[PDB]
């Protein structure tokens, strides 16, 4: 339990050893989730990179937020991927947010408070519970096989993961700075560990 | 009666089975009408899609709001259509509303509160009374013949239909959120039914 | 001419020298009028005060919006007054405004968008054209005889006056913030002058 | 005499029969004039069209406000014309107003409150009095010879014509909506006549 | 320098020894100021207490935010006091903020984002620079003479003092949690000192 | 002596007879000056033109503000000129202001309140005392030799000439409208003379 | 000691004699530093130029803020250089400044308050103490060898050097105008010396 308020992780150089793991105290399978966070990187025009990696035993790409080169964010559940295209690119800390529900397959997506159209992905799926979370590397296995081309170089922080779908009002509250309380991955009581060259510095985004 | 406030229908996948019907129990022909509604989709740059379909026995496209690819909205009365060109495209929940009158043929059109140039269409026509309304599919018959290419993928809600022409002040009130009361198709007294995969979710637009 | 958008006048102390005059370039008698404006003061529980004063040569109280103590607003035309009772009092920027017509004498009244019952006052009257408008003081003459007990201490702004009756839709538009264009006293082209301790400050009400 | 406040003419289709006449009660030659009017059309990118036509006996193009294709408005007095070039085009109700003075030849021009550079045209001219005004058609004779390609399709209203030069303050007052009093062509006491399919509808512009 | 984010001071018992001093690095006299701060106490119904005390050499009550028993907050400048009455009392962390300008004497007041009417106080005054700030005690001298009856028992934090007047939008951002940067008394770089039984604990208000 | 406030000169046609002369009552040579004024023309996309011409006996181009075509303003002192690049052009009344000091050669330049980079020109020069000022024509001699291609067509006014370097805050007050008092060429006490077609009209810029 | 508030240095011409020297009273090696300053020049589109030059005995390019042509600013430490590209260019007084720490090699970058992505540079380096600072010239030796092509022509001022890393809040305070106190190079007690044609003039940026 460590309060990471106003602090964010820093990935200055690309390497297959700089990464952090996150421990989820949840012991029940997931029927719905909502995981989003802040990040600031410059690789949005040079090569692809991962943002949030959630890999389990039977699947190395259970939940993976990946940024496709010249397309945009590529969200995926269980292995099937959907594309959220963007015709332009900016240089600023982006705060995207997405949700998912197995009961209806709706996949919401937000970009800096602006919402995107809902899509279907893995209707009736069942996300596991015992899994490993890696921020900065796209693991192709349960805790390893990091891709140098898919690695992340920049800043990252304010990770929050729920176990249900958040209303638009709750998403606006998260984007603005209002009070909240996660139940799966709390940024105020995160239980993480540092591996490689991962330094903690104050956040740049307000 | 079912109150659909703050809720909207969602269409994540294109299909000829995902659609809803709207009951119009009015037993009097229509000499004028006005319908405003919200919609949020990204198909404005890939292929055409339908928005509002009002089909009767003698005509499948009595009142039909269609989005033509690379031109814009294509409103039609009785079968003859007019074009409202838009040189650019945006990514945001758009709120359109149009009017029509048989006594003068004037066809108004509003896009997010901004008015468009008036046009003449079907002077002296007589819209029927008994009809079927379908949101998301272009029905080429009385309750069937849905086109997969003309289907809709996105969100839709707050559909309200009157039986006369609304003043510009009334249209501004509708766009802002002020009080109102439709007399043909009320979003607060909608009598609808679910067919296919059509779920109710909170609206994204404020 | 001076654009007074987002700005309002302030009266911090009660005095017979702090007041502002408003020049109406109209040269035609008025058979109907409608003026709406904002005001925020705390004198609603200690003593009476004036809000909108419109005095002419033959009558010092042609159009005068006064707040009577322990009853409410006291609107008057030509000298005859009517009472709009309020059993309670609030502490917030209140937006009230009324209308009047000589053809029928109907006097509407609105309080923060909520309408009041219509009343009759001065059926067949003829409001003069050459007159002086004073905001903050109850003038008992053509530009003088200011009452210290009836003076105003607080804020005032967004004064807009028409020469006809506004529909409920236009009233709701004014209350919400939609576009409009006054034709008697425009807040965007107000031709006023400062006298006494009257400072310009940003408005508190949204 | 008919009050045309908040109402405007509608030209939905192009034709040589759709036009309106305006009766000027002035019986004295004109040494200066100023006309402001609203108009909302979509023909600003397809073909030219007329806005204000003032033709007399000895000249069919005494005063003619014409919109040239791909350049802009082409104002003219007596027969000699000058060009007010616009490098871009918009889609919104535009409010133009221009002035002229025979004593100095100065030709002012305003576009939505923004002024244009002054120019000279017909120094020492003398505009006649007995003439016919046509809104929507470019007449090539005294009350006839309407051009099909030079027709107007859209809305028009709030036409006011003075007999002198208006100060920039008065022009801003007109643009914002403030009080005024014409003496040659009053929109509040217009004496007009209808011909063809010309319907009166509430204005779209605020 | 010490960052006091998410932390607040605690005054559990009334004593003439428990207080905190604040060092202002400003060496220029003040013509305007604005102090927003949080506080949560229960003495709002038992006896009076001080909130913000700013005393100098020539005046022991230069700037003093005091809560009068059964009346409300009693703001004062230089020695002249003004009353902001409130007929109701609540038990919750209240966020008040006030401003002042020597050029106009206007003194604003905000209570949990809700604004109060503006008043005049000490027009043309000049607040000194070399002074001592004490939170929790009403000092009757330059660093002493604390009143046990006027002492404070509760929590206080997030004190921020500017050197000018804040706009309503800035006050709204302060109350909500938006970014800001003080120039006289920064809660993120407070240079304070502890005295007596004053412990730092996480804040209760969100 | 005459007040030229709120009025500006008008040049409707290009001619070698339209110009205005200004008498400077100063009988001492100039070591520094500051000259700025308002102007509104459309020639900035067709051909070059002069703005402010200050010619003396020994030099026809002592101080001359010229607008080069496809580059921008070309300031000069004594005969040596410099270039101020503007990669774009606008259609609006532009208010530039520049200064110069012989003791350091520094020449400043402002554009509608926005400042430009500092440069050096004629270090140690000595501007003469007796001269003729011509607005609208580029004189190649002491009161003659006007170039038709370098003439000015548009409006001009607000001419002010100091005899030293003005501070940035003074430039800001000049651009906004604050009080000032020239000592060489006052717009409130200008002693000018008319020649050609030069009419006085109210200014368009606020 | 000299207070250089509201004043800035001016380099009007490129030359090998115009430069300013800065004396650092620090006698301890630097493990972290932070330089912030203002600058306004027009050479950002013609050729490269230096901004901040910090050369030592064993290294002529220890700390050098250089603007590379058609890419952007090129910060370097010890000899290794990293490029901060900018796809566009502006004409305005720009305020950029960076930080650095040898403990982890993290290097920040801010552009008018907007932060840039963090990078690694010279992990474990040790910046010397006895060095010479030159503003306007890129010294290739300890106090000489200035490049004419790399010289600076424009304005510069408000130079402040710390000996640690500044928080984002402190950076925002510096950018806004709040108080601060350097410990190695204070703009309020700068110990400099003039050489060549370097004149002091009031700053243009607010
Ligand atoms: Ca994988
Ligand atoms: Ca991989
Ligand atoms: Ca059909
Ligand atoms: Ca079909
Ligand atoms: Ca009276
Ligand atoms: Ca009285
Ligand atoms: Ca003709
Ligand atoms: Ca023709
Ligand atoms: Ca005291
Ligand atoms: Ca006491
Ligand atoms: Ca010459
Ligand atoms: Ca020449
Ligand atoms: Ca070097
Ligand atoms: Ca070099």
Residue numbers in the entry:
A (entry chain B), B (entry chain A), C (entry chain F), D (entry chain E), E (entry chain G), F (entry chain D), ...: 1 to 206
Article passage:
In this study, the effect of physical and chemical factors on the orientations of macromolecules was investigated through an analysis of selected well studied macromolecules, and important parameters that determine the behaviour of proteins on cryo-EM grids were revealed. We performed a comprehensive examination of how macromolecule orientations respond to alterations in physical factors, such as freezing temperature, and chemical factors, such as the addition of surfactants or the presence of affinity tags, during grid freezing for a standard set of proteins. Hence, electrostatic interactions at the AWI are an important factor in determining protein orientations in the absence of any additive.
In the concentration range used for cryo-EM experiments, both pentamer and decamer populations were observed in the same micrograph and were analysed separately. C5 symmetry was applied to the smaller pentameric molecule and no symmetry was applied to the decamer during image processing. The CRP decamer and SARS-CoV-2 spike had a more severe orientation bias, with more than 90% abundance of the preferred view, whereas in the case of the CRP pentamer the abundance was 50% and in catalase it was near 60%. The negatively charged B-face of CRP in the absence of additive is less sampled in the case of the CRP pentamer and is not sampled at all in the CRP decamer. However, this scenario does not seem to be applicable to CRP, as both the pentamer and decamer populations adopt preferred orientations in the absence of additives, indicating their interaction with the AWI. The orientations observed in this case look similar and the resulting reconstructions from 256 289 and 204 354 particles for the pentamer and decamer (C5 and C1 symmetry) resulted in resolutions of 3.2 and 2.8 Å, respectively. In comparison, we have obtained a 3.3 Å resolution map for the pentamer and a 4 Å resolution map for the decamer by averaging 25 000 and 51 000 particles, respectively.
